[PDB]
């Protein structure tokens, strides 16, 4: 009982109170906060965040929570994981390895590479990318002015020369997903720091000019590298494979803490393999590089320097096609000396997908299961130890829909023409924490024409998910004669309903049904964890009736249970899909 005076104040709480005070009360928590600097900006996207608390959709029981950007921890967490010695490895191990690089070469590009236009090095790039300890200016800035003392780099290196290298070791701000902690007991309130170890965005600029087609993969090079493969279209093409074989069984990629687990040999193998596709011209520069690499002085941003014995560094130009090439390699090494099965042969018997040191295999369960159980010690003694798990092998999938990949799986779409396809899947409770928290930091206070921008973008990769999907039609259906942010991840031209079909190849409404069973599941956490009522799907249904109910095109008859309640239909005009500022060019 608080005094009257004071109950103003509740007014104004908009979420369950977190304080969990024991002899004084806590209301509840407010829906904003305070800047690192003072300010008083949002927690969640306003827009969605208001739809869904529409629904009895609790924003704060979502697992997601920061970072600790804090010393103390970022201090611990380079000491627990990066501060190791090299994993020792089989003789044999980097010359087995060539060996099946060769067996995959591709001749035709065999010394072809060479250096690229600022004009393309320049595009989709990341301006405000770091700085770096020792540097003053930015990406960007150093583009503005400095691209003179780039082009230097470039000459010193591929003359081999004197450079000073060194990275600068910051802890990632970023809000991590919490879902299987707090669906166990775990409450965690924050989430340890992931160490960001990268060059001197000068360093980079010139490494990357040079080198784009390798880093940037762009004739992709990898076999199985789903690098630049927009997610909502790779399990169909995955379904493909596993429907190739008799008893299919798929065995993923587990490597505990990939880039911790590099050694200077691993960072050689691939310089070897950059100047198969390099001309001569450039091997010395990638030598030179390659060099530096193999043992690095780091600067952590509190001061501290630490002379690493390199492992990766996220931050270098290097990490996609380098830790990927590596992961397939070694995967494929692991695979055939635990099958027999020749290296040559690989693509006989298996198909590969790789994203960094994300990936798994397809092969029939005789040689998976082999794979799985000899593959433990195989890979460990070979550098990249598995996570320990209580069963002892690798992780068997007999199911398509239990293959894991990018922390995504294969849900079942049952279209209006009675085909089928999957799409990718995942816990609804995370998608929804993804959709709520994601805050475009173009820095701006965020428009309805970004939160327009990132439905959008969750409509192309979540329409098998009934609840996102309305959602984000609702979101969709604001403020028509205001054009979509660049700040999402996609965004689209004309119509985003005609822009979906551009992509998806079927149009939203052609969406017949979702598998029961799988949905089902994914959407399990959201009672777990609390985050839904058991009236929050009626509650979205209605919001979209009531929008859709008076003759008009309406855009969120598109969903085909909305549109058998409203009896109206939804005929889209011409839309085209796009990606916005770029992290690795997807080809759409």
Known sequence: VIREHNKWILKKIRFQGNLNTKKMLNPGKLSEQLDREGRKRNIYNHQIG?????????????????????????????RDKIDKSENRQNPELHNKLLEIFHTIAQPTLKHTYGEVTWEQLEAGVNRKGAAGFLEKKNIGEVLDSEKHLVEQLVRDLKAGRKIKYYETAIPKNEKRDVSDDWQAGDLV??????????????????????????????????????????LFNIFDKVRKEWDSFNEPVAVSFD?????????????????????????????????????????????????????????????????????????????????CESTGVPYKSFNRVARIHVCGDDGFLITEKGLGLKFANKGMQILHEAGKPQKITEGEKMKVAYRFEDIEFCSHTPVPVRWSDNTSSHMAGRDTAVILSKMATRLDSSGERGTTAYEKAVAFSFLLMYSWNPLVRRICLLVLSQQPETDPSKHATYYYKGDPIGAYKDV?????????????????????????????????????????????????????????????????????????????????????
């Open 255 to 335: 490597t505990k803490a990939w880039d911790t687990q590099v050694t200077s040999k691993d960072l050689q193998l691939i310089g070897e393999i950059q100047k198969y596709y390099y001309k001569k011209e450039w091997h010395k520069f990638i030598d030179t590089i390659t060099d530096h690499m193999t043992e690095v002085p780091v600067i952590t941003a509190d001061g501290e320097v630490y002379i690493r014995n390199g492992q990766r560094g996220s931050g270098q130009p290097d990490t996609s096609a380098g830790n990927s090439m590596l992961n397939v390699l070694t995967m494929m090494y692991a695979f």
């Open 504 to 588: 998806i190849g079927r149009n939203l409404s052609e969406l017949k049904r979702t598998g029961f069973e799988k949905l089902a599941n994914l959407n399990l956490s959201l009672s777990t964890l609390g985050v839904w009522t058991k009236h929050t799907s009626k509650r979205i249904i209605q919001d979209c009736v009531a929008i859709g109910k008076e003759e008009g095109n309406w855009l969120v008859k598109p969903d085909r249970l909305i549109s058998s309640k409203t009896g109206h239909l939804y005929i889209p005009d011409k839309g085209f899909t796009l990606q916005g500022k770029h992290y690795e060019q997807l080809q759409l």
């Open 50 to 78: 208001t739809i869904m608390s529409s629904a009895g959709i609790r924003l704060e029981k979502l697992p997601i929570v920061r970072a600790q950007t804090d010393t103390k921890t970022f201090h611990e967490a380079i």
């Open 189 to 230: 309130v924050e989430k340890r720091p992931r160490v960001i170890q990268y060059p001197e965005a000068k360093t980079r600029l010139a490494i990357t000019k040079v080198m784009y087609n390798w880093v940037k993969q762009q004739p992709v090079v990898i076999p199985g590298y789903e690098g630049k493969t927009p």
